[PDB]
Amino acid sequence: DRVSAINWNRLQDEKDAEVWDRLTGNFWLPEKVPVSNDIPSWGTLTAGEKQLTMRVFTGLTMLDTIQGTVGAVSLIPDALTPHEEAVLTNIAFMESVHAKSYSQIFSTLCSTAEIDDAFRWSEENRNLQRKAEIVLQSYRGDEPLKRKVASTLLESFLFYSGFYLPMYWSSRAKLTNTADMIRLIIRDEAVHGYYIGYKFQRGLALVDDVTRAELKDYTYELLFELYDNEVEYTQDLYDEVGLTEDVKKFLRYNANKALMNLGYEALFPRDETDVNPAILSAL
Amino acid sequence: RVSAINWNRLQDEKDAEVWDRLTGNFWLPEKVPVSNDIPSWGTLTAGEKQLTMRVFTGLTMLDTIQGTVGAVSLIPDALTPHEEAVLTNIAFMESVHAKSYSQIFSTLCSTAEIDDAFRWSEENRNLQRKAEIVLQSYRGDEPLKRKVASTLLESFLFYSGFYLPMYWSSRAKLTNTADMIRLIIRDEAVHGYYIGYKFQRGLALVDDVTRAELKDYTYELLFELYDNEVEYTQDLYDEVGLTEDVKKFLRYNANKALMNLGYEALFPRDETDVNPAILSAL
Ligand SMILES: [Fe+3]
Ligand SMILES: [Fe+3]
Ligand SMILES: [Fe+3]
Ligand SMILES: [Fe+3]
């Protein structure tokens, strides 16, 4: 059936206009960040440190490929307003921009062989493939609200967690221009998670008590299914440079943030999410 | 199952040239100052104002469809990951195009005129029919047909609604509005091209019998859209005396759409001889 022409002179929810204006006013492309000034500092990393960074960036690239090309678009049919549909087309585009920014970093700093090996690792890593399957299954299913749970967990939990490393390097005066690129991605991702979680809460208010309890159950279930897999992914990547336990605190910190974006309470208390202060500055 | 995109290996570089051109042409409606058209706008008859708002509202409808359904419906049928990325850009920019008509309206028009135009768009049977013909193709299960419909939408239906703002611009009226429409045109020319190109790439992957079916469908769909567009054009442009010339522009654009899909021009040059001031104004 019918599509109505959109009328931006009759807003149904002013939040849609505010998010449009913010997301569009923050438009950027990766070519405008001078990553080539990181070449000296990338030279000071060991082969193991460079491999870890490339692998983490390849995993993030996967999540943005999923969010732009499947995630954000699968939300469009469930919009409450026409203007939300428009915002979702911007979010899809910007996820593609985020995914391409990693290729711009690699193109400036790394060799073809190192890149090919990072992409091959991502195809074969069981934890990365499992995290993709879990969100893809929710996006392709037929329950709108559960899809926004998965999306917010992708934006505010899974994604945010791989940002640890560029911020760890930045805090040691390394790879500072790469860190600037990543802060452009975070500035988008904080809005996406906020907006999608907002629309989730508006959707929740229109269902009965039973459905609402079902969604809180599902949120916790998917959160801990993702969290379990994310810990295993985190261990295999970070164990050798010794950052695992601090990244796991960052994961707990971010899980709380995902829950709050959805309108639920923080689960982990403050003294168990106490990330190295330098990492928090760098965001 | 979804692989991370690698922009350092391209199955088809065309995807990266198109990405570079579309993203490099990024714009938002507020950058164009339409308020300088306020005096020009007062020189139109109520009829000419109504015609302009109705045409703009039809175009808004098609951009709403193309951003929110069309471009995204094309993403599962992509040949490359880079094409899927391009399509997210196209979907976004269609939402910008649609928004731009609201920017024009909010500067120049009254609330009651805006509402009249949106209501006409809900009710007009030729506009509803064009919308249903393309939505049915977009929501169907035949990828190459969907590309035919999307190319006819970008290169034939949309482009035809650009006649009016270029008409006004050729009389030195509404020239800022015109600069806005030329930003849309610069994106649409690439959209139609690119999608038609991907149609041609996809034709090489099926067999000769299927290609022959698609050529039939293309003609049939064109004839149906053309005829519906003539009725639409007549009801809009008959009173101001523009119909004959717009109909030449419809054929002119029907040729571009066919050629974007890799087919021959249907109408001969003596049938597409649109007022040269309108072509130049693009
Ligand atoms: Fe992203
Ligand atoms: Fe995002
Ligand atoms: Fe458009
Ligand atoms: Fe277009």
Curated annotation (Swiss-Prot), chain A:
Keywords: Deoxyribonucleotide synthesis, Iron, Metal-binding, Oxidoreductase. InterPro entries: Ferritin-like_SF, RNR-like, RNR_NrdF-like, RNR_small, RNR_small_AS, RNR_small_fam. It is an enzyme of class 1 (oxidoreductase). Binds 2 iron ions per subunit. NCBIfam families: PRK09614.1-1, PRK09614.1-2, PRK13965.1, PRK13966.1, RNR_1b_NrdF. Tetramer of two alpha and two beta subunits. This is Ribonucleoside-diphosphate reductase subunit beta nrdF2. It comes from Mycobacterium tuberculosis (strain CDC 1551 / Oshkosh). The gene is nrdF2.
From Swiss-Prot, chain B:
It catalyses: a 2'-deoxyribonucleoside 5'-diphosphate + [thioredoxin]-disulfide + H2O = a ribonucleoside 5'-diphosphate + [thioredoxin]-dithiol. Binds 2 iron ions per subunit. Its cofactor is Fe cation. The active site is at 101. Keywords: Deoxyribonucleotide synthesis, Iron, Metal-binding, Oxidoreductase. It holds the Pfam family Ribonuc_red_sm. GO terms for molecular function: metal ion binding; ribonucleoside-diphosphate reductase activity, thioredoxin disulfide as acceptor. It comes from the Bacteria. Gene3D superfamilies: Ribonucleotide Reductase, subunit A (1.10.620.20). Its EC number is 1.17.4.1. Fe cation 2 binds at residues 94, 154, 188, 191. Provides the precursors necessary for DNA synthesis. Catalyzes the biosynthesis of deoxyribonucleotides from the corresponding ribonucleotides. Belongs to the ribonucleoside diphosphate reductase small chain family. Tetramer of two alpha and two beta subunits. This is Ribonucleoside-diphosphate reductase subunit beta nrdF2. It comes from Mycobacterium tuberculosis (strain CDC 1551 / Oshkosh). The gene is nrdF2.
